[PDB]
Amino acid sequence: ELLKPRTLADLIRILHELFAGDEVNVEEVQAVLEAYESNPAEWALYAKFDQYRYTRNLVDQGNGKFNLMILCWGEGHGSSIHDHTDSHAFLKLLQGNLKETLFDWPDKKSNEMIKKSERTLRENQCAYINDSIGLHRVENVSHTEPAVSLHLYSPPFDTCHAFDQRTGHKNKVTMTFHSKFGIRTP
Ligand SMILES: [Cl-]
Ligand SMILES: [Fe+3]
User: Fold this and answer.
1) How close is the Cα of 20 to the center of ligand 1, in Å?
2) What's the CATH number where 148 sits?
3) In the chain, how many domains are there?
4) Nearest-ligand number for the alpha carbon of 136
5) Best exposed site among 43, 69, 132, 133 by fewest CB in 10 Å?
6) CA-closest candidate to residue 84, choices 134, 125, 121
7) Taking a C-beta distance cutoff of 8 angstroms, is the pair 177, 56 a contact?
8) Pairs from 23-32 (Cβ < 8 Å, separation ≥ 24)
């Protein structure tokens, strides 16, 4: 039974229940993430920015079946075009706006990757992607406002592929954590 999370801590407790089993009800998880009303004081600990690129800040290690982290996007910071390594990927905006651009998986032939669509994700909205849906790029296109997002990945994963927009060629990258549980992790 899905109740409104009262706080981030409450959301985390609820997520541990929703991931107690071996499968994932995507619509239920998205609904509870969306229902949490971002309260900046509850997540300030994790909102550690870097001047030059977006940061990944681990919030909860989950129960073996998922991770939860906070990503902090300075003005103009964005990602590569990338996949999510056969995992579910939920993205909830906590502050600001992000642009999500969707791409299809490339064919073996070297070719420009042309966007299939784009949308603006706004405060408190929860979006979802998986590899069957496609690849994406996420960017804070603002010149004046940092963005903060809450991401849930299931299963956890620590590598993905970045795709060259000119050719569709991919390269494996190891994803790193700027902090874990509020502690900077150089
Ligand atoms: Cl993501
Ligand atoms: Fe992503």
Assistant:
1) 22
2) 2.60.120.10
3) 1
4) 2
5) 132
6) 134
7) yes
8) 24/88, 24/154, 26/88, 26/128, 28/2, 29/88, 29/90, 29/152, 30/90, 30/126, 30/128, 31/2, 31/126, 32/2, 32/5
Is residue 169 annotated as involved in ligand binding? no
| DSSP helix/strand/coil, 37 | coil
Experimental method: X-ray
Q: How far is the CA of 134 from the centre of ligand 1 (A)?
A: 12
151 labelled binding-site residue: no
User: Residue 86 is encoded by which pair of tokens?
Assistant: 């056969």
Q: Residues 164, 133: contact at Cβ < 8 Å?
A: no
SS3 of 13, please?
helix
Q: How far is the CA of 16 from the centre of ligand 1 (A)?
A: 20
Q: Is 16 annotated as a binding residue?
A: no
Resolution of the entry in angstroms: 1.4
